Design a protein around this ligand. Structure first.
Ligand SMILES: [Cl-]
Ligand code: NA
Lengths: 219, 227
């Protein structure tokens, strides 16, 4: 396709408080995402308190990047990203700012899945055995492990689609696990495609992740 | 044994017959992983005996490790799968054994309290497993790599160990398993394969109770210990 593609990178949770390999975590993420030339614009969703750090980080980069303030939930912040998208935007990729190890290949794979799908997510087969349990803390059943996947990021969507879904989401009293669950809640015929992710594509939040992350770079 | 559980004799089977003690020795904080585990289990006085299931190649180092312990602790050789190893452990239990707890030798961080909680659940249940609510969001997907559905997140758990069972029951289930062509994810799934109406009780586990197998896990375990 020749469509305009937007990337929204969220850093509006705990924000920048984090640095691994002598680089702020968001910068590593930013580095990787800025090399994906298929992506026409990058929108950072940030905490207002980190505005100065962010402005500074963005000086290092040329090309189409800008930021907007996040909000009080994950979904409210994403929607702030969505409203900020270029009017030309036809496809949107989303990615956690605190997942710095997503390879360029993974962003590319997520994007290429948009050729024939309107919704795409990344996920990996769970290495830990899952059980579904009941409300009395007894096992209900053990799902087939070959079909149990843990989601990560990036995700990507037809921009008009997910925007309309987000608008319906905010008019509702529904709670969702992630954006792709919206296609279930709002009875969609649109199938959500899964792209195999990377086991090294971890979230870096705790103090130990940082240590682990410093070691991973060294290997 | 435990007074609240009819004074029934309790056995523990610790499996260390995977890659076993070596991977280069599996060490964390300056101590062999199996030693940290065995240290914890041997402090649980409710457990009447401890059976280690080992690789034959690790026997000499196993003996050296076991000298430090006074208790009713011994070892048998394991086999070629987790399950066949567990069965060697089950065959070696004291004739008086009425309850059996199993635990992975490479899960060194399970607290003593977690073992006690697992044992106390045997008071009213014949099967007990430890598990933790999944912090990562799970999807069930299909053969064409599309999302089938997102399970209700409050009911999605990742299992760990210990697990524990009525001894005759788990032994009988094991004989059925051996005579079958089923493959199980863990021992408690035996209850589903053989149509048991005895329910498997879930005890909240510990997020810190990780398995140590890869070089990554060791890095992670050390960062946890230095925290
Ligand atoms: Cl479905
Ligand atoms: Na049930």
């Amino acid at each position: 396709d020749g469509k305009f593609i937007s990337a929204i990178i969220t850093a509006a949770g705990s924000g920048l408080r984090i640095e691994v390999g002598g680089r702020k975590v968001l910068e590593i993420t930013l580095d990787t995402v800025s090399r994906v030339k298929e992506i026409d614009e990058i929108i950072l969703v940030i905490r207002k308190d980190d505005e100065d750090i962010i402005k500074d980080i963005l000086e290092k980069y040329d090309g189409n990047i800008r930021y907007v303030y996040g909000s009080t939930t994950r979904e409210l912040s994403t929607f702030e990203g969505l409203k900020a998208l270029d009017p030309q935007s036809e496809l949107v990729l989303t990615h956690d700012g605190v997942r710095p190890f997503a390879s360029e290949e993974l962003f590319l794979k997520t994007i290429n899945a948009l050729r024939k799908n309107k919704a795409v997510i990344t996920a990996t087969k769970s290495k830990d055995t899952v059980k579904i349990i009941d409300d009395d803390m007894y096992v209900d059943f053990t799902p087939n492990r070959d079909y149990v996947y843990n989601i990560q990021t990036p995700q990507a969507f037809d921009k008009k689609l997910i925007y309309a879904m987000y608008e319906k989401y905010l008019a509702s009293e529904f709670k969702v696990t992630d954006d792709s669950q919206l296609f279930e809640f709002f009875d969609r015929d649109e199938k959500v495609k899964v792209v195999h992710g990377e086991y090294s594509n971890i979230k870096i939040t705790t103090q130990e992740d940082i240590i682990f992350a410093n070691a991973y770079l060294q290997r």
